[PDB]
Amino acid sequence: GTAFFQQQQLPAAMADTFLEHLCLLDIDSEPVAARSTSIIATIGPASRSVERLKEMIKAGMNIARLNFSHGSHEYHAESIANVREAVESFAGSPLSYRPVAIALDTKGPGSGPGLSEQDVRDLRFGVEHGVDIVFASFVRKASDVAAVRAALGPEGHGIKIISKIENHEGVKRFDEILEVSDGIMVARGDLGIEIPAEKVFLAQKMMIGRCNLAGKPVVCATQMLESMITKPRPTRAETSDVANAVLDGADCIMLSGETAKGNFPVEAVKMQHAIAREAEAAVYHRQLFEELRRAAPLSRDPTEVTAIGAVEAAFKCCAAAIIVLTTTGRSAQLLSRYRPRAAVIAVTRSAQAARQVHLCRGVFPLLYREPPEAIWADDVDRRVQFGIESGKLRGFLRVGDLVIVVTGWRPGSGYTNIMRVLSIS
Template sequence: MPRKTKLICTLGPATEAEEIIGQLIDLGTNVFRLNMSHAKHEWAREMAARVRRQSDKRGIHVPVLFDLTGPSIRTGDLPEPLELKEGDLVEFRVEGTEPSIPYSTTVNYGGLMADVSEGKTLVVDNGTMLMLIRSKQDDRIVCEVKTPGKLGSRRHINLPGTRLNLPALTDKDRVDLALAVECDADYIAGSFVRDAAHVRELREAMEALEGNAQIVAKVEDQEAVRNIDAIIHAADVIMVARGDLGIEVEFEELPILQRRIVRRCHELGTRVIVATQLLESMIVNPTPTRAEVTDVMNAAYEEADSLMLSGETSVGRYPDRCVEAIVRIANRIERSGGLGFGAQVLLRDERQKSARAAVTLADSLPDALLVVLTRRGVLANQTAMLRPRTSGFFAFTPKEKVCRQLGLTRGVQAFKLAFAATIEETIQRATEHLRSLDLVRPGTPLVIVSDILSDHFAANSILLHHA
C-alpha cells in the first residue's frame, strides 16, 4: 500500500542544492517548507523555483510552504554571549535605552514591560534558561537567573501563561508575505496565531496582494489552545508546533494536547500537521533514537495529515536518512491501522455526507479504489478527513494549483486532468490516466465521488465504475 502520511521537509543550507531537492522528492518528500525566520528573499525565491523545476521534471505536483516569522520576542545583539550563573540578575530593556546593570540586553518588543508581571517565569532560548521576573519599569525588566547558561544574540523569549499584546503580523511578515504571493506559494503559515482574528488578518492581507495560498495556523501557546475551535474553523490547516507549545505548557501535557488537537481537527474537518523535533537527534546522528521512532509512530498512528522536519533537513548532516526514517516508520504503522478519528468527523452538509457514503462503499468492496473529481479540492480534503482504508485514493482536478494544495492531505494522490463536457468522458479520461500509470487493472471497481455539475451527473453524487 502507498504511504498515506505526508512529509514536509524544511529547506536550508544542507538541502538547497537542486540535485538534493530532487533526491528528497524521490525519497518521499511531499511538501517543502521555507522558514522565513532565516531565509533571505533571493534565496527563498530561488528555492521555490528549484522545487518547481524538480517537480515538473518528475511530472508531479510538490507544493511550497512559506512559514512567516510571526511576532516572536527576541533578545538584541550582543558583542559576546553572557555567561550566566544561578542567581545572576539580567536586564531586558527597550531598544535605544542604556543598561543599568552589567548583564543587560535589549528586546525587540517594546510592549513587553506592560504585558508581564513580577513573579512570573521568563523562558529564554527555547527552554535552555529559566528566569524569574523580579522587577519591572516602563522601559525594562530585571530577572533572576534560575538555571545557568549562555545568553547569545537574538535568542527567543517565551512567557508561559502570559497574554501578550503582539500584532498578528509584523512589518517583516508583510514583506515576506508579498514575496510568498510573488512566488505563488501554495501554503502560507502564520506563526504564533492566538485566535481566529489573526487567521483572518493573514488571509485578508494575502488576498489584498491577490494571493490564493491556503493558510496554515501554527498553534504555539496556551491562548491558541484555548481558542482552538475558532482557529480550526478559520484556517485551512492547523500545525501543532511543539517547540514553542512545549515551552508554554507543562511538558507532560504536550502529548495530550497534541492528540486532543489532532482529534478536534478530524472532528471539524481541517487538516493537521505535527511538527518540531520529530527526529531532532538526526541533525548530528545517522539513526533516530528509539524515543523518536515512537514519537513519529504516534503522530502517524493519530493519522495526522503530515509530519514536518525542520532542522533535521535544513541544517542536519543526514537529511536523506531522515526522510527515509520517516517513510519507514509511517509505512510500518499504517499497516497496523490508526486511531480512527475519521469516524468522528462531524458531517454538516450534503457534500460531506456524500463523501462518507463513498468512503463506506469503497472500504466495503474488495480491491476498490476511490476517485474524487473536484475543481477546488474541497471535496478531496473532506473525503480524506474520513480516513478511507482503501489502498488507492486519487483526486482529479483541472487546476495545477489545486493538485499542489492537496500535497499535504493524508492519503490523496492528485492528478491534473481537463474535465470533459460529459461526466462519462471525464471518468474515461481519469480511468485511462490511472491505467497509464499502472495504478488500476481492468475490472477494478472505482468508487467515484464528485461535486461537479454536468448534464448527467448531479453535484454531490457517487458512481460505481469498473476500470
Template sequence: MPRPSLDQSCTKIVATVGPACDTPEKLAELIEAGADVFRINTAHGKIPDHEQKLAAIREASAMTGVHVGVLLDLAGPKIRLGELVNEPLQCDVGMQLTFIRRGEPKTDHELTSTYGKLIDELTVGNRVMLADGMVALEVESVSADRAVCRVTAAGELRSRQGINLPGVKLSVSAMQRNDLDNAIWAADHGIDFISLSFVRTAEDVRTLKNVLTAHDCEALVIAKIEKPEALANLEQIVDAADGIMVARGDLGVEIDVAETPMAQKRIIRVCKEKVKPVIVATQMLESMHHSPRPTRAEASDVANAILDGADACMLSGETAIGDFPVKTVQMMSRIMQCTEQSLTHDMTERTVTNRVHPITTAVTFAATNIAEAIDASLIVIATKSGGTAWVKSKSRSLIPTLGASDCEETLRRMNLFWGIKPIAIKKMGHPAEIRTEICRWGKKTGVLKVGDRIVFVSGSGVVEKAHNSVVVHTVD
C-alpha cells in the same frame, strides 16, 4: 501522466529547505523519498533567498513530475537575544543577568533583545526562558531602562538565541512588517500554504487572510499553536484557519514541557472534529541531524502523532541542515507506513465541514464505504478545488486514493491531505472521459489490472447539473 507514489505513506511529510538540500537535484531526491510539501522558513534569509529556494523547488517538481506543495513559514514576532560580549556565556544558578534597553552590552552579564518593548512588559516574578528553555531566569527588579534577572536553570547562551516569556501577554502584533512583505511575495508567487507564527486569537488568522484576499491569493492559512493564549482560544482559531501546526518547539517552552503531549492530543482532536488538516512539528527525528538512524523514542513520537490523527509530520533542521536529509525522509516514511497498517476506517463516523456542500460530504462518505465494502483497488476523486478530496482525507481509509484535477494549484494543495495522491489529468471534462484516462494510465503503469474495481467520485461542478456522482467501475 506521471505516476503518483501509491506505495508511500498516507500521512504527509513536510520537509524544510536549507543548505543541506537546496539544490534541485537534492530536492528531487527528497521528493522521490516521500516529501510532499517543502517548507521555506522566513526566519532565515531575505526574499531573494526565498526566491532561490522556490525556483529550486519548482525545478525539482518538473524533474520528478510531482506537483509538490510549498509552505511559507512567516517568522512572526520571535524575540531573540542581541549580540553577547563573549560567547558562549555559561549561566550558573544564582547568577545575575540584566536586560538593558539601549546601547551595546558592556559586560558579560548585560543582555539586549530584538524586542524594543521587552522591559516595558516585564514585571517582578516573570519567567524568562532563553535558548528554547535551556536557560531559565526570574525577573527580580524592573526600572526604566533595566530588568534585573536571576538564573534559575543553568545552561549555555549564544548570540541571537530565542527568548520566550511564558505567561507574559505581549502587545506585539502576530504579523510584523517582514511578515507582511513575505506574505505579499507569497501571494505573487503562487505559494500554496502560509503558516502564521505565535497566533494568539482568531483575529490574527483573519488579518493574514485579509492580506491574501486583497492580493487575490487562495493559499491555505496554517495557524501555528505555540502560545498559551492560542490554547485558550483553540476552537475559534481552528475555525478561522485552513489548517493547524502543532509547533512544539516554542509551545514546549511557553507551557510546562510535561503538558505538551496532552496539548498536542487536544489540538489534533479539535482539528479532527472540525475537519482541518493538522501538522505536528519540531524534533520529530532530531537525532538524525547527525545520525543515520533515529532513537526509538523518536520513532514512537512519529507513530503516536499518526495514531492521534495527524495529517502530516514536519522535519525542520533534520532536512535543512542535517547530515542525512534523504535518509531522514525515507525513515519517516517507513515509520508512517508501518504505523498506518494499524489504522481502521470507521464506516459510521461522518464529519461535517462548512468548506464543502453537505451533499458533497455525504456522497464522499458513502463512496468511501462502498469502496471498503467491495474491496476496491482504487478510489479516484475528480475535483476542481480539492474540497471533495479534503473531506475524503479525514476518513483514514487505506484504499489508495487519487485526487485528479487539471488545476495545478489544486494538485499542489492536495499534497497536504492525508491519503490523497494528486494526479494531473488533461481536462476536467465528462466523467466517462476521466475514467478512460485513469484506467489507461493505471494499466500502462501496472497500478491496475483487468477485473480491478474502482470507485470514481466527481466533485461539485464536475458533473453538469449535479452536485456529485459516484460510479463503480470494473477495469476491462
C-alpha cells in the same frame, strides 16, 4: 486469496476490540497501501541543490517548507526556483509526475501584539511568487488569521492558511482559530517552551482530534527525528514519535533541521516514509470510521453526502482506490475526513489544488494537462481513465480491482454528487 488478508495488518483490522487489534499486530505483515501521511521537508543549505531536491522528491517529500525566520527574499526566491526546477524535471512523464506544494512559514509577531511589518512584506512575497500554503507563526486568536488573510490580498484568496499553535493562548482559543483557519500545525518546539514539556503530548492529541472532527488538515511538527541531523539512524523514541503522530490522526508530519541543515536529509525523508506506511496499516479503521461517521453532523451538501456514501462503499468492497475529480481539492478533502483505507486519487487541472491536497491524508494528486474535450462527459471519462492509468503505473491498482469514482453533474467547483462502483480492466 489468503495472502492478501495476511498483509497490511488485515487480521488486526478485523478484530472486535482495540485490545485484540493490538494483540494481532504482526511485524511480518507487510504494508501494501501507498503512504498516505504527507511529509513536509524544510528547505535550507542541506536540501537546496536541484539534484538533492530530486532525490528528496523520490524519497517521498510532498511539501517544501520555506522558513522565513532565516534568509532574505532573494534566498527564498532561489529556494522556490530550485524546488520548481526539480519538480518539473519529472513532468515529461505525466502518469508518474509528483506535484510538490510550497509553504511559507512566517517569522511571527515577536514582541508585538499582531501582524508584524516583516510578515506583511513576506506574505506579499508569497503571493507574488505563487506559494500554496502559509504556516502562520504564533496564532493566538481568530483576528490573527484574519490579519494574515488581509495581508495576502485579493490575489492570495486561494492560498491555504495553516495556523501554528505555539503557546498557551493559542491552545485556549483553539476553537475560534480552527474555525477561521484552513488547518493547524502543532508547533511543538515553541509549545514545549511556552507550556510544561510534559503537557505537549496532551495539546498535540487534543488538536489532532479536533482537526479530525472538523475535517481540517493537522500537521505534527518539530524534533520528530532530531538525532538524524547528525546520525544515520534515529533513536527508538523518535521512530515511536512518528508512528504515534500517524496513529493520533495527523495528516502531515514534518522535518525541520533534519532536512534544512542536517547530514541525512534524504534518509530522514525515507525514514518518515517507512514509519508512516507501517503506522497507517496499524490504524484500527473499524472504530475510527464508526466514530468519524457518528461524530460528523447531518448535511444537506451533496459533496458531503456523496463523500460518506463513497467511503462506506469503498469499505464494503475493499476498494483499491476512490478516484475523484476536483477543481479546488474540496471533494478530495471531504473523502479524506472519513479516513478510508482506499487511496484517494484526486485528478485535477489546477496545479495549485494538486499541490495543496497533500495537506489531506490519503490524497494522491494527479495533475491533468490535456486541453478540454468538446463533449463534457467525454472530458470527465478521459480524466477518470488518466486516474486509472496512473494508478496502474504506480502500483495502486491492478486489473480486477474495484474502484469508487466520484464526479459531479456539471462543470465548475461545488457540484460533486455521483459515486460509481467501477471494475478495473
